[PDB]
Every structure is written in C-alpha cells, then in structure tokens.
Amino acid sequence: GFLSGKRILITGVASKLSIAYGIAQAMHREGAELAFTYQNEKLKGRVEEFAAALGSDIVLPCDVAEDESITALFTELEKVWPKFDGFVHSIGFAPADQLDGDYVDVVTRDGFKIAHDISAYSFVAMAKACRGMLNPGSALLTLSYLGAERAIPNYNVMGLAKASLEANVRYMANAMGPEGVRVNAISAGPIRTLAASGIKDFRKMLAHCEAVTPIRRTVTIEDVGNSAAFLCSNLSAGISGEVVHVDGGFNIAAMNEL
Amino acid sequence: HMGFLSGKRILITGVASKLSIAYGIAQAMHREGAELAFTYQNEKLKGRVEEFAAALGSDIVLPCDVAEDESITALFTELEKVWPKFDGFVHSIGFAPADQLDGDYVDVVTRDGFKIAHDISAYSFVAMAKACRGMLNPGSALLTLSYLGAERAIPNYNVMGLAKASLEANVRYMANAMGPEGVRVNAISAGPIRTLAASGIKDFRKMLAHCEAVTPIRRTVTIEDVGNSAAFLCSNLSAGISGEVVHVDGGFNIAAMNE
Amino acid sequence: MGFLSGKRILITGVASKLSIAYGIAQAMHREGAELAFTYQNEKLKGRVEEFAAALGSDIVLPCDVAEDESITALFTELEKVWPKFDGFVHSIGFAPADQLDGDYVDVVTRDGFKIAHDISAYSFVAMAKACRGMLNPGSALLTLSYLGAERAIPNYNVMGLAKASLEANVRYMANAMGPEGVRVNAISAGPIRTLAASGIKDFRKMLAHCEAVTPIRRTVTIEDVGNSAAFLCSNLSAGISGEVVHVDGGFNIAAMNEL
Amino acid sequence: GFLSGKRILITGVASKLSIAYGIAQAMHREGAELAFTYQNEKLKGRVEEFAAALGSDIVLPCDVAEDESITALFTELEKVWPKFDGFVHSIGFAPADQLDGDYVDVVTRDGFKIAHDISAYSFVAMAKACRGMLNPGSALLTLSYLGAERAIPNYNVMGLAKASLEANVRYMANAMGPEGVRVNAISAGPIRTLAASGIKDFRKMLAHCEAVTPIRRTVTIEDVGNSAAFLCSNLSAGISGEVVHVDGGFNIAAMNE
Numbered sequence A: 001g002f003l004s005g006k007r008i009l010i011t012g013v014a015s016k017l018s019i020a021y022g023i024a025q026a027m028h029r030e031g032a033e034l035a036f037t038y039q040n041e042k043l044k045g046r047v048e049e050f051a052a053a054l055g056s057d058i059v060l061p062c063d064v065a066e067d068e069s070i071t072a073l074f075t076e077l078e079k080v081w082p083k084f085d086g087f088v089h090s091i092g093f094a095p096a097d098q099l100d101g102d103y104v105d106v107v108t109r110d111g112f113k114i115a116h117d118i119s120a121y122s123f124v125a126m127a128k129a130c131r132g133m134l135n136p137g138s139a140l141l142t143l144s145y146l147g148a149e150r151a152i153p154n155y156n157v158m159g160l161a162k163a164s165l166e167a168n169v170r171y172m173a174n175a176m177g178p179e180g181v182r183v184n185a186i187s188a189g190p191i192r193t194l195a196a197s198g199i200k201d202f203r204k205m206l207a208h209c210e211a212v213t214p215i216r217r218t219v220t221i222e223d224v225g226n227s228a229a230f231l232c233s234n235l236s237a238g239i240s241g242e243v244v245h246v247d248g249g250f251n252i253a254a255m256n257e258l
Numbered sequence B: 001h002m003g004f005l006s007g008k009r010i011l012i013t014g015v016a017s018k019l020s021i022a023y024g025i026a027q028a029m030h031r032e033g034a035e036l037a038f039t040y041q042n043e044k045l046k047g048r049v050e051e052f053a054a055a056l057g058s059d060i061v062l063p064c065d066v067a068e069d070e071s072i073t074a075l076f077t078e079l080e081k082v083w084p085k086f087d088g089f090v091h092s093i094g095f096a097p098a099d100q101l102d103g104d105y106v107d108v109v110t111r112d113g114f115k116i117a118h119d120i121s122a123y124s125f126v127a128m129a130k131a132c133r134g135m136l137n138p139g140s141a142l143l144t145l146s147y148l149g150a151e152r153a154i155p156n157y158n159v160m161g162l163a164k165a166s167l168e169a170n171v172r173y174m175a176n177a178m179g180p181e182g183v184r185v186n187a188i189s190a191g192p193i194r195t196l197a198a199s200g201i202k203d204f205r206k207m208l209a210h211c212e213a214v215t216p217i218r219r220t221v222t223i224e225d226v227g228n229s230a231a232f233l234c235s236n237l238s239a240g241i242s243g244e245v246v247h248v249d250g251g252f253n254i255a256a257m258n259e
Numbered sequence C: 001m002g003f004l005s006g007k008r009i010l011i012t013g014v015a016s017k018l019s020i021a022y023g024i025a026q027a028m029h030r031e032g033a034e035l036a037f038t039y040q041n042e043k044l045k046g047r048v049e050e051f052a053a054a055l056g057s058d059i060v061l062p063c064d065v066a067e068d069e070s071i072t073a074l075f076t077e078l079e080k081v082w083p084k085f086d087g088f089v090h091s092i093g094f095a096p097a098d099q100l101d102g103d104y105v106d107v108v109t110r111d112g113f114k115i116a117h118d119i120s121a122y123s124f125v126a127m128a129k130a131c132r133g134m135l136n137p138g139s140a141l142l143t144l145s146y147l148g149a150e151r152a153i154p155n156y157n158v159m160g161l162a163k164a165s166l167e168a169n170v171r172y173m174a175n176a177m178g179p180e181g182v183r184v185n186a187i188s189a190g191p192i193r194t195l196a197a198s199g200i201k202d203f204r205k206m207l208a209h210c211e212a213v214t215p216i217r218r219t220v221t222i223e224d225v226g227n228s229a230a231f232l233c234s235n236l237s238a239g240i241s242g243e244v245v246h247v248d249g250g251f252n253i254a255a256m257n258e259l
Numbered sequence D: 001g002f003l004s005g006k007r008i009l010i011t012g013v014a015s016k017l018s019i020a021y022g023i024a025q026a027m028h029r030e031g032a033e034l035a036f037t038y039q040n041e042k043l044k045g046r047v048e049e050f051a052a053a054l055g056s057d058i059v060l061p062c063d064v065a066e067d068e069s070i071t072a073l074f075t076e077l078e079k080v081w082p083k084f085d086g087f088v089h090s091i092g093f094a095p096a097d098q099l100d101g102d103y104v105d106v107v108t109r110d111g112f113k114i115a116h117d118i119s120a121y122s123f124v125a126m127a128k129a130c131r132g133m134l135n136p137g138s139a140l141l142t143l144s145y146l147g148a149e150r151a152i153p154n155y156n157v158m159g160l161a162k163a164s165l166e167a168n169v170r171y172m173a174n175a176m177g178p179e180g181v182r183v184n185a186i187s188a189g190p191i192r193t194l195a196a197s198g199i200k201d202f203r204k205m206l207a208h209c210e211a212v213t214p215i216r217r218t219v220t221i222e223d224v225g226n227s228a229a230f231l232c233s234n235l236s237a238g239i240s241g242e243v244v245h246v247d248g249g250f251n252i253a254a255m256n257e
Ligand SMILES: NC(=O)c1ccc[n+]([C@@H]2O[C@H](COP(=O)([O-])OP(=O)(O)OC[C@H]3O[C@@H](n4cnc5c(N)ncnc54)[C@H](O)[C@@H]3O)[C@@H](O)[C@H]2O)c1
Pocket: A011, A012, A013, A014, A015, A017, A018, A019, A020, A038, A039, A043, A062, A063, A064, A065, A089, A090, A091, A092, A093, A118, A143, A144, A145, A187, A188, A189, A190, A191, A192, A193, A194, A195, A196
C-alpha cells in the first residue's frame, strides 16, 4: 500500500457513515498503521470496535474544546507512537439553532465562537500539541465545505468557520513546511452523516448536487477516503496548503437548472 | 458638500487617528455629501473622535465596544434618537492580542487569541448588522476592511489571516441574507498602510517596502485611495455590486515572482 | 463637476442603446468625461455618430479589432484631435454563432476557438499596444468579462475560455503598464439583454434564473455597469489595478438558492 | 498498483527531465499500459526507446497544430486500443519572442494565437477526436502554471493560454462528466525542462520558488508523476474540473522576507 510504513491518527469516526470512517478504511487498505480518537464516553465502545476491525487498539479520548484533553491525547499516544506521520481532522460542531434560517437573524456571538473554536481552531490546536512527534514527510488533513467559498442557505456560520479552517490550512502549511510537514484539506461534496442531518434541508442540497454535479452522483466516503489516503501519503509530497475539491466538480458548474 | 452620497446617512466605526483607514473614508464620504455619525471604542478615544467628527460637520459621536452585545444595542438605541433610519455603516475594526502577531503561527496561536481575533475582526460586522437591520433604508450598503492575509499565508499576520477569511465569508452570508430587503454588503481588501494598529505587525515596514516595490502601480495605497473606494461602495453608484471583496492594493495581489 | 472632469476616454462596442458601452458612455458623460467612440463597420457608423453627438462628441472612428492596420489607423486619427488621453473602454466580444449552442466538446472548433480568443481577449492588449505612448499618467483601461470565465456555464462554451484569457490579460497588462501610471481592470457583469445576448441559447431562462437567485433579487442594468465603469476609469479608483470587479448583484457568491 | 487495468496515452515526452517522463514512470510503476506520442521525426527515436523501457511499443506521431494529425493518432491508436481510460496532455508552445520582455511590448496577434492554439485548444481537440474511445471511469489530465492566476514577468502570453486551459478543464469536466469522464489539471511549480529554458530568467524563478515554497524545495517530475497517476486513477473518482496545485504550496505564500 502507498501508506506502508505510516502511522496516522484519525479523529471524527462516529459511525460507518462518517467521512473519517471512509478515510480509515482506505488508509488501512493502503497499509497505514492507525490510531483513533473519540469525543466522549458515549462514543468509546463503537470506535474501539471500528478500530479493532482495522487491527488497532490505539483508541484515546479527545474533546477538542479542551486544551488539556488535546495534551492528554498526545501524552498517551507518545507511549505507543513516540513519533508518527500526521493526523486526519474530521470534526465540526455549531449549536443546532445556527443551521436553520436567515443567517443574520439566527447567528449569535456564542454560536459563532463555538463553530470557529471546534471546526477551525481545533485543527491548529492539535498541530501545536503533536508538533515535536511528527516525522519528516508527515501530512495533516482537514475536511471543508464549499460553504467556505459561497453563501449557502442554512449552512450559515459554519461557512465562516470553514473559511477560517481553509486559511488555517494555509498558515499551518506555511509554518510547518520547512520542518517537513504538509497540511491540506478536502472540500467534500454533500454526504449523508449524522452531522449533515443538522443542516435545514440537507436532503435538498444532497438532491441538487446529485443533479448538477458533472459526474452526476454524490461523492462517497470511499471517494473522500482515497483522496485523503493520497494526500497523507508521500505520493502527494508536492502538495501543501491545498483545498482539494472532492465534490465531483459541483463547485465549477453554474446555471444548469435554467 | 454635495456629491454621489448626497441623501445618505452613514455610520463610521474605527476612527482612532488621522492615519486610520476610517478617517480617509470619513474624509471621502463628507466630500461626496454624506451626513456622518461616528463611534469610539473607549473613553481614551472619545475626545479625539469628537474633534474629527465636528471638523466633518457631525455631532453624532457614540461609544461602541463590539466585544459587548449591550454596547452595540445601546449604540443603535441612541443612534435611532437622531437617525430613525440610515443607509448603512463602515466596519473598520480589527483586534488580536499583540502576542498573536509575532512569530511562527503554530507556535504563538492560542485558543483565546483565535477566539478574540475572530470575535472583534469578523463576528462584530454581523453583530452590528443584526442590531441595526430594521433601521436600514432600502439602498443601504455595509462595508468592512479585509487584507490579503485572508487569502495568502503572510508571515506574522498569523491568526488575523483566519479572522479575515471568516470576515470575507461573513460579507458573502450577510450579502445573501440581506440582499432581498435592499441591503448590499461588500469588503475592501486594502494594501498595507501605516496605521496605529499596523505598527503591531512584526516587520510591517518590510511588508510596506515589499508592496511598494512589486505592486503594479509602484506605490503604497493611501486612506484617500481606500476612502474613495469605500465612498463608491456605500453609494448608489455601486448598486450592482454585493458580496464582493474589492482589492484596493494597487494590484499587489495579482503579482508573483517580481525581482 | 463630476469625478471624470478633465478625462478623455475612448469607448468601443456601442451597437445600440441596450449596449453595455452605451450605459458606460452615458454615466461617464454625466460625470464630466469628454468622449470618443469607435464603430466596427459601415452599418453601425450612423447610429454611433448619433449616440456620440447626443453625448457632445463627433470623434467617431472605424475600428475592426480583427485588423492590426484598423487599430493603428484608429490611434493615428485619434491623435490628431487627442494627442494625449486617459484610457479606453473595451466592450467587444465575438465567437461564431455555432460555438454558443450545444455540448462544448461537440461544438468547439479550432477556428471558433481562435476567433473567440482573438476578438474577445487579444483585442484588449492590441488596442493598449497601439495607444501606449498617448496615455497620460493616471490613465485607466477597462474590459467586460462574464462569470463564464470562472465557471462552466452551458452553451457559453469557448467564450468562457476567451473570458478567462481576457481576465488573465487584465492582470498581465496591469502588471506591465502599472509602472508608467496606467491602471487596467475588468467588470464581470451579470446578464443583460443586449444585441449580443440574443445569440446565447436560452438567454431568457438565464435572466430569470439570475433574477431569482442574485442577492439583490434583480437583473443588473447598463446604468449599474456604467456607474462602476465610470468609477474604475476615474482617479477615485487610483488604488485598484489588475482587478475583475463582479457587477452581478452578488450572483457569483450564491450556491443552492433555487433549493 | 492503483492504475492496474487502465490504458493511458501520454503526450509531451521530449527528454528524461520532461514532466510527461515523470508521469509515464509513475503510471508504469502503478501498472498502467501506456502509449506515447511524439511531435515530429526528431523526437521519435527518444520516445520509442523510453516507451520500450516501460514495456510499450505503442508510439505514434501527433502535431496538435494539425486536426488531421490528431484524427490519424486516434485512427492508429484504435487498431491496438479500440477503448482506453484517457490521456495526459503535457504540451505547451509559444514563439520564443513572446517570453522575453514587457508583456504589452512583446505580445503579438500571431504570438497570442499560437500560444492559445497549442497550449489550450489542443487539449479539447484531443478529447473531441477520442470521445467515443473513452471507457466509463476515464480521466483526462493537463499541465498548467500559476501564470494563469498571477501576472509573472516574461511568462507573458503563456499566462493567458494557461488561464484558457484551466477554463477548458472546467468546460470539458462539465460536458464529459455525465458520460463518465473526469478532466483535471496539475498547476506544477517550476521544474528545469527543455521548454523551461524558453522563459527569460527561468533560473531566478526556480531559486525564488525553492526559497519561499512551504516545502522549501523545487518539486520533481516524480511528485507531479505521483499526483498525475492519482488524478487518472479510480482513487480520484470524486475529483473533476479541478486544477490541483503541485508546487509545494508556493501559490498560497506571500511576503517572505
Ligand atoms: N456532507 C458532509 O458529510 C460533509 C461535507 C463536507 C465537509 N464535511 C466535514 O467533514 C467532517 C466530518 O463530518 P461528517 O459529515 O463525517 O459527520 P459525523 O457526524 O459522522 O462526524 C462528525 C464528527 O465530529 C466530531 N466532533 C464534534 N465535536 C467534537 C469535539 N468537541 N471534539 C471532538 N470531536 C468532535 C464528532 O464526534 C463526530 O465524530 C466535518 O468537519 C464536516 O464539517 C462534511
């Protein structure tokens, strides 16, 4: 596999639906050794099961809201992985009220702070915490959405948070590049996940994208998985600070329904 | 005066000194016939801002600390007393703790540092829009000030780059939300200009010199260049333009591989 | 006096009262410009003479941008009445009709691609080459582009490629001509019913779509584009070069609005 | 390998430094059957040799200035490859005079025509001539440069031709997507190739990019090759109409003192 010899930490595996689940399956297929985080105790058991089906018993708590939890993650991981080769940030949150209605009516200071803190800051927070553990040739990866570039109904403040996160990719790639670390994002098209369900009229976005995307289907966690595996491998040694659209080309289409 | 903003009432935030981008905008809007009102952050800036306002024929000078929801509500409660309706506002406000703007981004970025940059530099634009939405006339325009740091990794600009990316996305979401009721929302991506707050960016004087050398117009932009651009974007001349980040940087942003 | 007082601006692409260039001409004359006009061929000469006369000009000269000799003769004739001037509006676009109906790969041809690029993109720099010595300090060039440059729009086809080339032309001309005091910008205009627009398949559906989903909830007008164009060729926009300004009511920044 | 069972045609192999060389190596290594084109008789020997090193004896002429040359390529290719899974367009040309001096002084109608014709039109010309030979799941790839997005000294009219090429990618991705074909570009950082010599002060561009690129090195035909292999493989199934920057992140950097 093109990840033979790599040790990648994967965040954000909530279920078999999760983008991060797809990424893990592809990275295991390509020979990566994997470790896994879980947000809270409620999620531990399922992530342990998913971890074990991929030959891993490295499963550790991380609530990215808490600096101590991020430090503890890497404190505990260092004991099995003194050094490793990067991680997948597949984590977003905003209060539910932020994702239904007029952006300006519905956005709040606290909704804004949480969305950016959890979806944007958490990525560089994780990087600070493991910086000295990363081998030369390491790769970090986050997940963004066209909401960052365009005004999308109901996505609302998550658009601002993804725009922040995509700038984070750039500032992180620029800072960590010299010492041999690449940083990228996948801008993924719509996929049915627990989190997707939190966006008002998600199913309308999903249907619309299926119709007008050049490849004429919604992308799968397999498609994202393979792209993510590639971006965290030495195959992508020439790419850093990049937001790669894995949306079937939806972002480049205009006026297809009239 | 009389000009392309005759009939417009515009609120101006972020005047600190005569170097301030908001001063150049205030100058340019007065010259084009706008009635102006001003905000000041704290008591330290009140007196300075009052004399600037009086020189431009305004005695509407009101406190606003955009970290505080109470302060923004009270701004527009007081503003309503003299201006029941008005035609929008200029958001010329940035802030991060000093420690954010000096060193390797990953090393010096902090959670509070990130929180404060995004809160003051990005959230505060839509906060002001939420609290004055009902007072905006049809044909109103909101304007904010961004920087190329939103688009490119700039040494030492660090977490302000992310807060500016968030700001530019806010322009788009607000434009989209407010367009149907007749409100336009735009940004100017200004080139570097020696302002009080600019002195806080490590190596600013090298940015300035770099930008002077490679910018197509072969000069630094002025608060006059930005003021004329802001005056246009808040005027009915710009009626076909919403959700845009207009680069007023002499075209620095389109240059690569110079020298 | 208007913000174009003391400027001498040459206007191409006036075909009718619906032409973008005619809206530009009106706004620029309103703001105090003195104007000169080109006409493509003998059939348009009379109408352009009439529209120019209505804006206080009888400087009305043939220019077919297909021909190097025609562009040279234009500036050799112009110089006799305008030894110096302050820039020109390039409002010129053409591809063979067969290029703008069907699947882009089926319908695009080598000659169709050549003509689109030659007339719509190359002509902007050919004109700049031909008058470079006649431009005052503070001169400004303007071309017209379309969202088709950035996105794949059905049936705009190879005109999308020609517009992308044109916007790249804006950047390379801004960068080359900036040091000698010349600014170069584009307006990326929303759809407008003009003679040329009727050559685009389902243009009526395009208008209705942009009408529904554009933040400002209307079509832009030649007044909107004219006002922006006046601004971009005036000293008010002295800070802006190498820029494609979207004058499309925010259409470009909206996604999934139809639902 | 992840191109196992794919048939890819490769253009623009000139020498061992050729981006198209790096791409052939990477695609061979991952188990693609390759075919190669050569511009003219002068290059035919070098390519027949490079092809044989990779196990291909499919080496056909194509001058993309000629519609007939493109038809004939696909007429000959069909005899051995009735179907195939796409091609790599690694082809650029402008008259030498275009790439030395101030853009406005140096550009000419004929300079502009050829740059656009060879560097941009030829990509969709090849897609037109082979559309019915492409299997479901096929990928086309072209090579672009940041000259499309930024004004770069001396790159001049090639910048416009690459901007047209990048738009081409999007219009081809939109048209061909529904019949199961993806179309993408790599925007490669500077690399010393035969063609690169043609740019005035190319050396300075290399050293500039090397100094300020986040990965702090020049990219290689093997970095571009790995990215090209990926983008023409089923691994990239969710990517179309995309210009992927393989320049070490140079494009996102500004103000490196
Ligand atoms: N349509 C889509 O599914 C889509 C599109 C593009 C982008 N994305 C992004 O992909 C990523 C993965 O989301 P998904 O769609 O797979 O959803 P999901 O619900 O399957 O996964 C989201 C994950 O975020 C984690 N998370 C939330 N708050 C956390 C915290 N405080 N600490 C740690 N983990 C926390 C959850 O535990 C969960 O594992 C997100 O960043 C999302 O914004 C999703």
